[PDB]
Design a protein around this ligand. Structure first.
Ligand SMILES: *[C@@H]1O[C@H](CO)[C@@H](O)[C@H](O)[C@H]1NC(C)=O
Lengths: 48, 48
């Protein structure tokens, strides 16, 4: 995958998180991207 | 009768809230904390 500038491999699924309008890509303990708002269809995905 | 009473009273003292089994709790605590440090430290620039 290469979302908007990220890169790497994973399995993109549906998600249940809720992002505020300014609140675009989530992050985890070790500080690695693990959620993202897909640009065109503004869905929230989970990268594993 | 004395033997029976002592065997009975063991359970209450074990069930008392003080750390009777701290010696066994420390093992799980040490392991979890070490692994957690290892994962949390994966987010440091190190001068990069
Ligand atoms: C183009 O983008 C708009 C919003 O930026 C979106 O609503 C629309 O579905 C997109 N069209 C596509 C992906 O074909």
């Amino acid at each position: 995958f290469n979302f908007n500038g990220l890169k790497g491999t994973g399995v993109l699924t549906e998600s249940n998180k809720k992002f505020l309008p300014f609140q675009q890509f989530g992050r985890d303990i070790a500080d690695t991207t693990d959620a993202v708002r897909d640009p065109q269809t503004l869905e929230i995905l989970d990268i594993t | 009768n004395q033997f029976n009473s002592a065997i009975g009273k063991i359970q209450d003292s074990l069930s008392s809230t003080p750390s009777a089994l701290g010696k066994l709790q420390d093992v799980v605590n040490h392991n979890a904390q070490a692994l957690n440090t290892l994962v949390k430290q994966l987010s440091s620039k190190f001068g990069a």
